[PDB]
Amino acid sequence: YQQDQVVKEDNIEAVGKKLHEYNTQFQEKSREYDRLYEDYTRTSQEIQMKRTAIEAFNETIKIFEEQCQTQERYSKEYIEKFKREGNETEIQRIMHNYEKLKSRISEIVDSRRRLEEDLKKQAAEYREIDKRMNSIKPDLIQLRKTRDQYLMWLTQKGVRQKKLNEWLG
Amino acid sequence: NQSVVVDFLLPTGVYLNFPVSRNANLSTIKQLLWHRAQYEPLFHMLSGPEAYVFTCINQTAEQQELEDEQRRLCDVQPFLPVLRLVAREGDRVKKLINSQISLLIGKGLHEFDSLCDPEVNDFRAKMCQFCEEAAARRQQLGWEAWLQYSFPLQLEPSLPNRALLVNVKFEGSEESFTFQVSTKDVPLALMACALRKKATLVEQPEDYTLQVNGRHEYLYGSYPLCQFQYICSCLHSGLTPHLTMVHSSSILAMRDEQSNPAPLWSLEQPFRIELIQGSKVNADERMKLVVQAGLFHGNEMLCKTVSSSEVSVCSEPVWKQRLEFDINICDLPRMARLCFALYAVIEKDCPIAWANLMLFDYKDQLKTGERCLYMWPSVPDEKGELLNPTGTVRSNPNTDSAAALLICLPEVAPHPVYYPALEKILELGRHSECVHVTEEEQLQLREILERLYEHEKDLVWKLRHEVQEHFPEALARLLLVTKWNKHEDVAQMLYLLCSWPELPVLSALELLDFSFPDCHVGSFAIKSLRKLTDDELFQYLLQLVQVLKYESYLDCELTKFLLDRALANRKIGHFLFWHLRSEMHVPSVALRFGLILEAYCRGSTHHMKVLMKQGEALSKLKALNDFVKLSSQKTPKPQTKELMHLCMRQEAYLEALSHLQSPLDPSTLLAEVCVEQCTFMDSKMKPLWIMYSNEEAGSVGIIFKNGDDLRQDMLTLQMIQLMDVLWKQEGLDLRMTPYGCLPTGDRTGLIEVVLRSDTIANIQLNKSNMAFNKDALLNWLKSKNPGEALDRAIEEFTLSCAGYCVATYVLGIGDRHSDNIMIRESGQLFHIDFGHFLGNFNRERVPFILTYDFVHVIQQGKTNNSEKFERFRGYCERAYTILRRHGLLFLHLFALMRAAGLPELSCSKDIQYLKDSLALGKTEEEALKHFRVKFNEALRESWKTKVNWL
Numbered sequence A: 001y002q003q004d005q006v007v008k009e010d011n012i013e014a015v016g017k018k019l020h021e022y023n024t025q026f027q028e029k030s031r032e033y034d035r036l037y038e039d040y041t042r043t044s045q046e047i048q049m050k051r052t053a054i055e056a057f058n059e060t061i062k063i064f065e066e067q068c069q070t071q072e073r074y075s076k077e078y079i080e081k082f083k084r085e086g087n088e089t090e091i092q093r094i095m096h097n098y099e100k101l102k103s104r105i106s107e108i109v110d111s112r113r114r115l116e117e118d119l120k121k122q123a124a125e126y127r128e129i130d131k132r133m134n135s136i137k138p139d140l141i142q143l144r145k146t147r148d149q150y151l152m153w154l155t156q157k158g159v160r161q162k163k164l165n166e167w168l169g
Numbered sequence B: 001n002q003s004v005v006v007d008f009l010l011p012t013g014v015y016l017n018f019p020v021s022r023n024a025n026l027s028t029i030k031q032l033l034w035h036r037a038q039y040e041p042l043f044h045m046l047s048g049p050e051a052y053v054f055t056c057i058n059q060t061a062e063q064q065e066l067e068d069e070q071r072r073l074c075d076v077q078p079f080l081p082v083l084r085l086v087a088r089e090g091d092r093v094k095k096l097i098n099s100q101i102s103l104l105i106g107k108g109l110h111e112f113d114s115l116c117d118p119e120v121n122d123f124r125a126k127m128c129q130f131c132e133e134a135a136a137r138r139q140q141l142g143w144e145a146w147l148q149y150s151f152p153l154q155l156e157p158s159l160p161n162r163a164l165l166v167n168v169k170f171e172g173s174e175e176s177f178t179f180q181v182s183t184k185d186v187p188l189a190l191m192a193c194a195l196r197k198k199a200t201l202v203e204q205p206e207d208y209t210l211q212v213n214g215r216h217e218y219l220y221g222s223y224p225l226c227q228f229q230y231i232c233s234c235l236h237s238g239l240t241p242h243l244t245m246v247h248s249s250s251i252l253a254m255r256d257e258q259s260n261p262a263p264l265w266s267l268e269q270p271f272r273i274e275l276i277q278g279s280k281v282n283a284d285e286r287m288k289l290v291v292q293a294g295l296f297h298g299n300e301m302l303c304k305t306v307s308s309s310e311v312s313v314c315s316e317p318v319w320k321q322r323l324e325f326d327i328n329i330c331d332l333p334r335m336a337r338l339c340f341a342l343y344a345v346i347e348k349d350c351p352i353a354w355a356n357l358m359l360f361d362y363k364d365q366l367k368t369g370e371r372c373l374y375m376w377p378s379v380p381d382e383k384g385e386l387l388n389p390t391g392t393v394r395s396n397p398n399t400d401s402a403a404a405l406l407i408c409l410p411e412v413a414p415h416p417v418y419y420p421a422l423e424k425i426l427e428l429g430r431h432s433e434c435v436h437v438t439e440e441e442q443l444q445l446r447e448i449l450e451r452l453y454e455h456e457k458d459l460v461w462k463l464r465h466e467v468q469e470h471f472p473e474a475l476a477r478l479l480l481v482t483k484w485n486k487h488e489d490v491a492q493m494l495y496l497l498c499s500w501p502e503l504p505v506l507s508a509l510e511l512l513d514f515s516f517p518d519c520h521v522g523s524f525a526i527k528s529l530r531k532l533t534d535d536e537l538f539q540y541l542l543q544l545v546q547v548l549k550y551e552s553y554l555d556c557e558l559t560k561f562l563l564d565r566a567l568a569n570r571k572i573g574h575f576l577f578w579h580l581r582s583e584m585h586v587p588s589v590a591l592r593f594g595l596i597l598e599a600y601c602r603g604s605t606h607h608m609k610v611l612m613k614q615g616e617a618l619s620k621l622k623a624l625n626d627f628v629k630l631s632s633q634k635t636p637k638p639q640t641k642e643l644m645h646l647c648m649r650q651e652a653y654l655e656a657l658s659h660l661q662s663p664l665d666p667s668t669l670l671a672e673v674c675v676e677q678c679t680f681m682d683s684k685m686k687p688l689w690i691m692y693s694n695e696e697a698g699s700v701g702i703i704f705k706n707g708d709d710l711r712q713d714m715l716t717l718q719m720i721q722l723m724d725v726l727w728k729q730e731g732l733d734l735r736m737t738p739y740g741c742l743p744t745g746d747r748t749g750l751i752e753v754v755l756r757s758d759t760i761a762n763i764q765l766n767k768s769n770m771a772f773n774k775d776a777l778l779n780w781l782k783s784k785n786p787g788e789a790l791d792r793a794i795e796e797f798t799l800s801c802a803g804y805c806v807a808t809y810v811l812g813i814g815d816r817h818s819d820n821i822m823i824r825e826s827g828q829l830f831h832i833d834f835g836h837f838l839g840n841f842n843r844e845r846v847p848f849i850l851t852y853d854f855v856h857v858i859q860q861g862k863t864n865n866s867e868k869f870e871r872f873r874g875y876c877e878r879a880y881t882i883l884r885r886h887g888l889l890f891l892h893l894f895a896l897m898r899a900a901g902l903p904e905l906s907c908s909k910d911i912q913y914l915k916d917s918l919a920l921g922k923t924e925e926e927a928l929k930h931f932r933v934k935f936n937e938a939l940r941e942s943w944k945t946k947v948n949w950l
């Protein structure tokens, strides 16, 4: 009784010719997916590097913010005792030193922000890769199942293993 | 440029910014800092330089107090060139360890904290405590015990009774005493005799041990001198041994370098789940998304896999569906596994991603409430299943960009519910024991258990009491016939497991496979693995590590077992460390492997120092290989070789690569780089060839290969080693050279250089005819073995060729040719670069292969020498037979390696290859007559191959 065969019956040479074609297309699409899966994994590593580099910027900035806390708390003592007793020159050094610290932080924040912009762009890549991967999968699967149906059709028909290997090579 | 601008934050609040050299050590920078600080405000408030320690944010985003100030800023390698001064004191011992662990293991310890996971926090708490105790307990005990931990004996698997001389000396004294001693002498005999040479009063022999000078290999215990690898290696070669007597005190000097730090079934309504929302889905808009779900236990389904409706494709698809499964809450087994797969479908099949969740948590509680499962991408393969129940349970680490199904396990009862304790299991399990006295089914079960199908399964289940009684080894067969989707059955089977007799190591290996998920099963398996000797455990350590990949929870028996053994034996620790460390780049295992490496490190602070030196050597080799890779594209090789050296001459490069224990063998010492002999090979990834020297020993070499994958070559070499042990254990030394191969990192590793060797292709290239050219291998062995030594050299070749012929047949390794087969000057054929195995490459069985060239050497140049050729046939036949006797060991081991995700070892066929190649389905007589037909046909083929060769 009836069974849903995808292969239309022509002859051994006609069917074997399509096995070579469908196998060639399968190996080529398998190369394509594997090329993307590298870019997937590589990007997944690169994003995770970037994500911890952002954390290191956070922690470094934290250290700078702690320095600002200290300076303001510490300066209180040696500005009263310096305002009286003449030394407004040291007050000016103390404070200009502080302004040089605050100015460095802005640069570190600027470089943090640049990496945040890279991670945003590289997240866009990752997603697009995965989208492209998921569009190629259904082709890769149906070409696998087609290739296998033609093998099984020829095996049933009684085609010798030497002949099948000519086509699959 | 050479110098870096560095930010300096002083504790007065003052900020100071100036250039310093990359090569400058931190102590030099602190001097420059104090010199500059003078002329900046509030200097007089600071204490002395020694009162403070630099702090910085390292590459792993963590603050590090930099205690060792003899370190270059380029090796400290802070994230930004920013150094902060802080108060020295505050338990500096624990601070320093916590820092070094992060850099050593690759992942930062704060990344465990960030997760806010109890399971992680309890693991760390429980295991770090456990390891800290053992290491403290190790430090208390004697020097002999410590010597056993640090340098366990390297014995042969073990007749001669010969006499041969041995050089001995003492520690410090230049002069040396050579004296005679027989093969079967216990080490004390040599020591006491060496002390008489010292006297002819002062010391006693039991406060001493012999060090094989050159290396960290010590000679002690009740075993005779002939069973030690060094002496055995010295006897076979003919060379004289060289030892050094060392005092007990001098060994306590190694031990005390540094100290370790101080210290219900009342819920019968069906199981169901709420599927809420997708997130961050990437798919084609024309298609529509479906989510298929199914409950699993091991590989088998518990019930039918119900699915969702087709919602339209978008980033944030929303279902809000109740999914009801055909199984009750009370029926669920302990390791019940809900498994998802998001599919993209044409409306009228693309697997996007998948995710698995354990229904019970690590504290035995049934999980309720919302869960945001971050999914893993589906990769298409030959057997495209709906779901992936063998896949991991921990979520995708990339929560930033990855997909996710949002679901919600409903509240089943007001108070929480657990899986019952072992007491309540044995309550239900003990009862309902019945149907004794059945004679007809004793033939039927024996027939069944001397070889599963559904008819046969119910018979095994009925006669489970008799299986335990008469067929104990068939536990795994019984475990699978047990219906895990009914809690009555699960109680009854567990009751038997508690009373089940201890199985042999072989049987217990099978029970570690993914098909046997239950905690009680794995526990029983380890119970039986606990009798492994350190030598035998080492032979399976790769496989045990891989099995962790399909464990459910972090704290498990297998992990505790591995850590137990690593803390007791430093060599096992060493190789456990690198097996784990080389997979920390793999997202699916990074956390699990991360937390274990922390535990090991905390109980192995001694070795932690050694692994740091290795890590930094490997750190520089990447940088060196990357320069060579880039240079090869630009210029010719000769000049790249001189340019490689110029990089190797540097302070940071020379010292990092100099003076470290080999990763391939921590007993082996890599001392002085021979930069003259350093080079790189012509190969796609251009792997570095680093030669060392040692005035104590003696010339070791390594290969740093980066870009290709070495896991398959390690597995293959592990197996050829395992074979060699099995052959040696039946008194057959086939002169194999299973060189060391260790994956250290992301497509990165070391390979042992076998000294005094060349490829068959290169040996034959000297005497070329350009279209007799033969006898090139035979001519070569004359120059390296003159006169009487040639007869040995031919025997080494015959013996070695036999083993490598059988090995390569059995493992199914093709693509064997002149430029990947190597001879040694001793005359030992050995194989390199096993890129493919088990028939892969296209997928056909690799026939047994004799080369004419090798047969000609075996026959000693003669056209017919059947006396000598029969010997070789016997060596092959004996070899093959022995491997069959241990066929199940190979199958079980390879079955666990399926965990590793190697392309060429991924399924039953790949395992079946080993079954057929070893003819395990046939009797030993039948197997061996089939091997002769293969042999004979390889011999007929041998002529036909070289007649075609022009």
Ligand SMILES: COc1ncc(-c2cc(-c3ccnc(N4C[C@@H](C)O[C@@H](C)C4)c3)cc3c2CNC3=O)cc1NS(C)(=O)=O
Residues within 6 Å of the ligand: B679, B680, B681, B682, B683, B684, B685, B687, B689, B703, B705, B710, B713, B739, B751, B752, B753, B754, B755, B757, B758, B759, B832, B833, B834
């Ligand atoms: C896993 O992958 C590998 N497995 C093994 C090896 C390998 C290769 C050779 C060898 C092969 C061919 N030629 C030579 N030369 C002769 C020598 C006098 O001078 C050299 C510069 C060239 C040496 C020797 C050894 C090993 C392992 N232990 C050895 O002793 C290499 C790779 N990696 S690769 C490069 O990509 O094949």
Ligand SMILES: [Cl-]
Residues within 6 Å of the ligand: B079, B080
């Ligand atoms: Cl940077």
